[PDB]
């Protein structure tokens, strides 16, 4: 078990679905001896000999920036797509779309209220939970 | 356990717990001055008045130094005192036999009860200190008896780390006061005229620093550590050094040790604290042992400290006006004997 | 030399990146099915030249820019990584 | 122990704060006292509690007895009234 | 651009006085180790000055390193003419604080924020 | 010359004072005062208090002068924030003000003969000042440190019994002066030890800023009460006691007279104190009153954003001069249009009479010069600040 | 007469700051968003920057929150963006602004709500 | 609401203009607040001139300096803003002159006009850093011995960096970075709503 932090408790970045990428904030220092997921990685490779080169976040951003673009640059949704040749791929690929019917898991709302796990962990969940049921 | 938070100074946590049975002495003082300034949680037993320990308080933080009343000859005393604490350290140790207290007591009966309640408690380490070269045939009563107790312990607490300083070297300690406080003797009687007991000094900060970073390190279970220091001396250079610092004339003449032991007895017989001892005579020209051993200081984590660089803050006080505001520089250093 | 990935870094709107786009518009439907499995990312960059980033086996990254390139030198550049 | 169940696990070593020394702790709580206190049976849909004792009590404010079921109790007091 | 020059005009005359001062201080480290009983070495202390007169070698600026001798000269004055005890020198050679590592798997074993 | 430093444990340096002696021979040629032993960031902390929570720091900056500190910052905060004090509570501030320069005074003549030798004049005296700060006492609940006079008017009506007892030791209390005025005043040996040392010719006294008695005991004549009334100082009749010659004798004849003055002031303000509320009526500056707020909505919301937020004064700054017994005390007041203010210069007067010690005790011996600090009745905590 | 430097400001020599925190400090240029709670925007008005959050470790004895940061409790306020970006400069700590985003406008008109169909 | 008499916001007012003429190569804003005090804003350039001419001038004598403070407004780019508050026991009035200076662009030392401000300056640099030119003896008066950084300045922390303890080991006070048991807690007070026009 190597604990790690939660997003109130690191400057991580995330990205919602149409690329927006956002930077998290910390809110509140990491509890007991856990640690920023980055740097938990970070650390297990140099005492593995293959060395993450980023030690400062800073510089797993600069990371970020050469696998991705939209990583490093904020509140910035990317404009251009090529649609035209994902079609062409797509009619390359053929499938059957079995008869089932296509249904979402969340149904109703009590299916809404526990399912990460920051919410399975909450008593406030848990209690609106059992109100619905 | 206490997760460790902070930046590392006082008012910070490192989640020690530790009772400390002699705190009150030269090394103790020490001791519980890194420990508090860790920011660990440190237990003080104590029986002399509150007055004396006052000097503990202000080290370590609100709320980090609690003091228990402790009788060593009541074990309810240390049964409670190590109660919470999960780290036990034992520098219980004296120099001069004392009416209720004998060498045993104050290195092997006591030292014992103490980690013997320790493990009763599940105090995860019990960290005792014993002499450097303690044959259990040494010649000193006192230095063999601490041999006996770093036997019994281990049966009492297994796996209980056993660190074994040499004489220690630092402010308010004997090794180097003793010596310099030979001034009113107008002259210092040495054995052999101080040749053939080769003596290794070490600061007491190194010892603590080590006594320290032991409770804070896995790699230590029944290890028996040995800090010692960083240069070897002849007696005759040290006596002479010391005397060099302080600036009093140095007149070394030989004096038979069948007739000194005697002289140790004399003052032994004081009252109030003799200022040498039969037992220490003997201690003092017992040669110091060579380093082939688990090593202490460096092993442990710090790098000794030279005696030279050191010394005047100790010998300072010794000095008279005239010689106040001369300077390590000015006086020439002793030598070492790799012998 | 172990290929697994390669990305093509283009900056949308630049000057430079021109020839890439063109690219990407004429022959990158090719250049996948050709190798059906390995990843080939188009990504867009901002005020930075156009790189083809190459990932080889065993975590080794190689840079080639590709910066005012005409469309099949950038599509010759492609071929040369996966040889 | 405490009002709120503050009590040192038995491994705490606060508790060594404890040692030779009385945790000190309050036998009279209030969750209890302010039970022992009946209701107050008013005849009037609203009531007010000034606190006891006017300006030497708490913020005068009026509370809604009509829900027969339940009784209301003061934001302040506790004491509770009933219609 | 465009700034007002406080006492040397570029960074050349601006150096001068920095000789002057290391001068000062080199001079005066010794006579400090005595008047102040310090249990330093006279070496040592020496090549504190040489720490701090280098710590703040990369300034470029003329008008920053005119007042930085200007503290510096102030900071002497207090150890010459003395009004700064021991514990104030001492503090030079933050001989109390306890080191920290600065390598990563260090911090990443102790703290929370590198 | 001998280097030696008037260390801090010494009595003569109030506790907080090192002034780097040079002496040529027992004749001290130059003095260096190295202050900063007492300060505690007082400007620093204040911008970081609200309004009111600000207020206790004035009472500690010259701790023998509580009442008036607290009148200079509350003139401020009232000026920037254009209301005034109702009527009874500036007599109040006025009374109380007068008391608090009986309480210096009687801290500075006796205190200087301490150091010079004479120990009797401050016993009689002190019982006199405890008698006064149980004034303090019942009208705050404070000996001293009391937070009575609040920016906007003053906290608490006084007690019902207050002004006959403040008669009663206003009455009985000249023969008191009077007779340290015996003890101390024509004894050869305090003439000698204080007249012609330390005399200031009067244009160097106003470009040192001495600006207090030390201004007015060289015959400048100067009084922030008469010249500048604030409060009411212009519905009270004083003589401002203004000496001829300035040695530390016609300085102290100076501290004395204004102690008499100050019990005239007295008289008037318990013989004309009016009838009426004690704090203004604006619930936005002064709080509500403990039975309003327990029964009116409008009040608890103005309680309530009262002491946790603020007064939120009007963005402006201004320079608030009052006749504090050492001298002028002035604040400078910066203030964003925030509850908190943006800077709180403190002028104290001490700075500046420290600063004249050199010039003043010229040609003088170690001994002129433990008269030359007593003569500028300086407190640290003004200087320190 | 005046002399030239293109050197950027730095004094970070002379603010006196101890080097940890001048190396290892991001603060953040940004316009304070309103607490949802109340609909008054007259803390939407000025720029702020603020150095990185740091450890809040409970203390022991009284469990009180203890932090070993100096910069923490320290905001300062800007009125323009430009100048806060000025200080991150010369005083050498890492900047990243965030541009303001204000409401954009919103048309309404009470008529709508009585709307034959909406 | 205060009483107020524009017997003074007229007097002042026109004294201002009067300096301003007599001054113009300085004076750049001359204001008279609502609380009737006037503040003549001036060049840094201009901090000998312009206060030599009140000290000495038969229609306008300023013989005494009240005050010599610097609010430091961190947005403005001449951060300090030293202020200089004088009095005229002649004419019973106050006037203040006030400049800006940035850190490294000192200003002119007044002590000349006034020894008054031999102090001050110097508790203007130990607190804000501002440097003045021709100062007798600048150095900190307030401050500890070794104190580094300029304590009133807004970016400076209130705990500070360094605080002070006895250690037994070195049997000396040490200072150490700073850990408080109980950080300052910094209280949210400005409210959403605004007060008036102004
Ligand atoms: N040169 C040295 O100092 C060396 C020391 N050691 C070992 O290190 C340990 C610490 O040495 P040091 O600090 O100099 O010893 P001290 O003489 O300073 O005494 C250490 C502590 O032991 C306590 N103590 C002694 N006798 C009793 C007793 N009968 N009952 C209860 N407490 C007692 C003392 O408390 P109190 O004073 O309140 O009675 C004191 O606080 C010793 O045990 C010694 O064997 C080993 C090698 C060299
Ligand atoms: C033992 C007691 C220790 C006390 C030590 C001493 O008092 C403290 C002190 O050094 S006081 C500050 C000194 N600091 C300067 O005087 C500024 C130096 N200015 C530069 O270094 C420039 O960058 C320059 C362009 C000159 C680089 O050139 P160069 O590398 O010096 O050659
Ligand atoms: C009245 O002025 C002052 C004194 O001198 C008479 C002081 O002694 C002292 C301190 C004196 C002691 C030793 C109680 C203070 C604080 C003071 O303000
Ligand atoms: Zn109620």
Known sequence: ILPGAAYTEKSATYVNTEGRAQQTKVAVTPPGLAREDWKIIRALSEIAGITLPYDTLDQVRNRLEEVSPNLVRYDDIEETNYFQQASELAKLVNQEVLADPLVPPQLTIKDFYMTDSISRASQTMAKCVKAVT | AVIPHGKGGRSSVSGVVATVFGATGFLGRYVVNHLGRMGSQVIIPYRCDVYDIMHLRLMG????????????????????????????????????????????????????????????????????????????????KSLRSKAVGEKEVRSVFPEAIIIRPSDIFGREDRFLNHFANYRWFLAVPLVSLGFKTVKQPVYVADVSKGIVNATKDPDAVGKTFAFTGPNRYLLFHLVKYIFGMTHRTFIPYPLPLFVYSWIGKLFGLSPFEPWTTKDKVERIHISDVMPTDLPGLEDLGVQPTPLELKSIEVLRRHRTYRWLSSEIEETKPAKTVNY | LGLREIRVHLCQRSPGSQGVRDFIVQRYVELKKAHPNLPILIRECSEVQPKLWARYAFGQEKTVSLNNLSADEVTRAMQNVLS | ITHTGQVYDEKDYRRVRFVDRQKEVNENFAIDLIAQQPVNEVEHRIIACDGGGGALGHPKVYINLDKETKTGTCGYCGLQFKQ | ????????????????????????????????????????????????????????????????????????????????????????????????????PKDFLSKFYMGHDP | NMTLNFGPQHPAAH???????????????????????????????????????????????????????????????????????????????????????????????????????????????????????????????????????????????????????????????????????????????????????????????????????????????????????????????????????????????????????????????????????????????????????????????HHFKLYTEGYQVPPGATYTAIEAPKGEFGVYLVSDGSSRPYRCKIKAPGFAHLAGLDKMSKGHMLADVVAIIGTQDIVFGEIDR | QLITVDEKLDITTLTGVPEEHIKTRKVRIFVPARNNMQSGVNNTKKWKMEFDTRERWENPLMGWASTADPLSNMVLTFSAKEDAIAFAEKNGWSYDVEEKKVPKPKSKSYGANFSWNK | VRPRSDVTHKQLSAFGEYVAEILPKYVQQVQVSCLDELEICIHPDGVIPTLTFLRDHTNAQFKSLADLTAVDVPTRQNRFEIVYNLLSLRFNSRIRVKTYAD????????????????????????????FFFNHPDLRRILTDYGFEGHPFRKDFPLTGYVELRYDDEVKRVVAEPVELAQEFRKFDLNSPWEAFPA
């Open chain 6, 15 to 301: 506790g907080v004072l090192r002034l780097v002696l040079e002496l040529s021979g027992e004749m001290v040629r130059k003095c260096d005062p190295h202050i900063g032993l007492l300060h505690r960031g007082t400007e620093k902390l204040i911008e970081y208090k609200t309004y009111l929570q600000a207020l206790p720091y004035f009472d500690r900056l010259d701790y023998v002068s509580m009442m008036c500190n607290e009148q200079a910052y509350s003139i401020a905060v009232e000026k920037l924030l254009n209301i005034q004090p109702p009527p009874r509570a500036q007599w109040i501030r006025v009374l109380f003000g007068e008391i608090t320069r009986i309480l210096n005074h009687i801290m500075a003549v006796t205190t200087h003969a301490l150091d010079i030798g004479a120990m009797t004049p401050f016993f009689w005296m002190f019982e006199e000042r405890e008698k006064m700060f149980e004034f303090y006492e019942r009208v705050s609940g404070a000996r001293m440190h009391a937070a009575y006079i609040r920016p906007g008017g003053v906290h608490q009506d006084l007690p019902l019994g207050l002004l006959d007892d403040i008669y009663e030791f206003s009455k009985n209390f000249s023969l008191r002066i009077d007779e340290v005025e015996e003890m101390l005043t024509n004894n050869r040996i305090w003439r000698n030890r204080t007249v012609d040392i330390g005399v200031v010719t009067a244009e160097d006294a106003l470009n040192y800023g001495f600006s207090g008695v030390m201004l007015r005991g060289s015959g400048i004549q100067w009084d922030l009460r008469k010249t500048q009334p604030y409060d009411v100082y212009d519905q009270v009749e004083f003589d401002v006691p203004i000496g001829s010659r300035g040695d530390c004798y016609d300085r102290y004849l100076c501290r004395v007279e204004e102690m008499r003055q100050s019990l005239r002031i007295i008289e008037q303000c318990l013989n004309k104190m009016p009838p009426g509320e004690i704090k203004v009526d604006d619930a936005k500056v002064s709080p509500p009153k403990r039975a309003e707020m327990k029964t009116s909505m409008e009040s608890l919301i």
């Open chain 8, 103 to 130: 850190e490294l662009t000192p200003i002119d030392s007044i002590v000349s006009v006034h020894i008054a401000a031999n102090w001050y300056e110097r508790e203007v640099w130990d607190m804000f850093g501002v």
């Open chain 5, 1 to 100: 651009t465009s700034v007002k020059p406080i006492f040397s005009r570029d960074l050349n005359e601006a150096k001068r006085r920095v000789r002057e001062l290391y001068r000062a201080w080199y001079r005066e480290v010794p006579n400090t180790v005595h008047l102040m009983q310090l249990d330093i070495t006279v070496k040592q202390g020496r090549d504190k000055v040489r720490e701090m007169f280098m710590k703040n070698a990369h300034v470029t600026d003329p008008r920053v390193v005119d007042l930085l001798v200007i503290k510096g000269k102030m900071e002497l004055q207090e150890t010459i003419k003395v009004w700064k005890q021991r514990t104030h020198v001492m503090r030079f050679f933050h001989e109390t604080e306890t080191p920290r």
């Open chain 2, 61 to 140: 933080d609100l709320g980090q130094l609690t003091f228990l009343e402790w009788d060593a000859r009541d074990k309810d005393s240390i049964r409670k005192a190590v109660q919470h604490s999960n780290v036990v350290i034992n520098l219980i140790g004296r120099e001069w036999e004392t009416r209720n207290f004998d060498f045993e007591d104050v290195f092997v009966n006591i030292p014992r009860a103490i980690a013997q309640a320790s493990k009763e408690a599940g105090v995860e380490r019990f960290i005792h200190v014993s002499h450097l070269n303690a044959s259990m045939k040494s010649s000193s």
